[PDB]
Amino acid sequence: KNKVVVVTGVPGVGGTTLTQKTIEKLKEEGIEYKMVNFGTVMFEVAKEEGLVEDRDQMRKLDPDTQKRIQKLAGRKIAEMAKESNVIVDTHSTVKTPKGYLAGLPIWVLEELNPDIIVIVETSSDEILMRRLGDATRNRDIELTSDIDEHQFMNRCAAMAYGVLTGATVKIIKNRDGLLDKAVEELISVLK
Template sequence: MGKKVVITGVPGVGKTTVINQTISELAAEAVEYQNINFGSCMFDVASGQGIVESRDEMRKLEQAKQRELQRSAAQFIAKTEGNVIIDTHCTVKTPGGYLAGLPEWVLKELMPDIVVLVETDEDQILMRRMGDESRVRDAEGYRALCEHQEFNRAMAASYAMLTGCTVKVIINADDLLDRAVEELKDILR
């Protein structure tokens, strides 16, 4: 039986970069993890149904449809054996408010061992987002990013209450990727 680790962060925090670097370095130590992107699982289902053409469109779907997609992704991931990193968002900012990225029915399927929040200074996130032309993101200012990161912390605490897992915050500051990777490696070993 493997370890299930949920790794979250607001868009633009560099979460996926930290994950990819960590997995690469751990592989050299013969510590294997499968990285599953929760949003990609949801997108595969949604695009197969012909209801979206890009991942960014999913957060604008009706809540009932988002719940259905979340459940399908969780069921797929729960069946995965070995050590698994679940790359996802703690919360999703929708036109109707924040949506839990891992609602109760998803958590009960996944039962993570730990939830990791990747964070950094909001100014750094804004700069990273402006430089990323590969995604279409809603415009958010400094205060909105502060609110989003704070809401993620509160939600991660509730996830821990529901599953008994622990919560860890890792800071991914500019030019300090190696430090964030070392922290994550220590958790995953």
């Protein structure tokens, strides 16, 4: 009871838009999912402690501070899952200056116990271009091969999640012009 779905992707791949369009379309049939953004759970604890003005400052903090707030947020979100189904928008790995940080390290992974881990992907081309069109959230404008490296290490981390807990790992394409098709696939997956 109470399903826990994790939705992941490098910044710019659009996992948030996918989650939101799928949830509003799930509610047309009375399938209620609550969206939880893990970075927002984290960003409220950080903003309480003075470590960050905004949320793009979090992947740059010392990784032991990152892991400390990540663990809190996983506990908090696990509690949210006791009340309703949740789709958790978060990361297979977070890119930090000191490397990729697993977003669900085994202790956090065990606390959420997701049923399905979704990887939202597209070509690094389209990601870089989406990142450059948004002068709101200031994201890594990195080379496309750096983007591909991230999507590469996201697959690796995510599949280890599946080896550890038995969750299925679903890859869904969210390509420029075809968001609707990513929603049909994610919707179909949650039934």
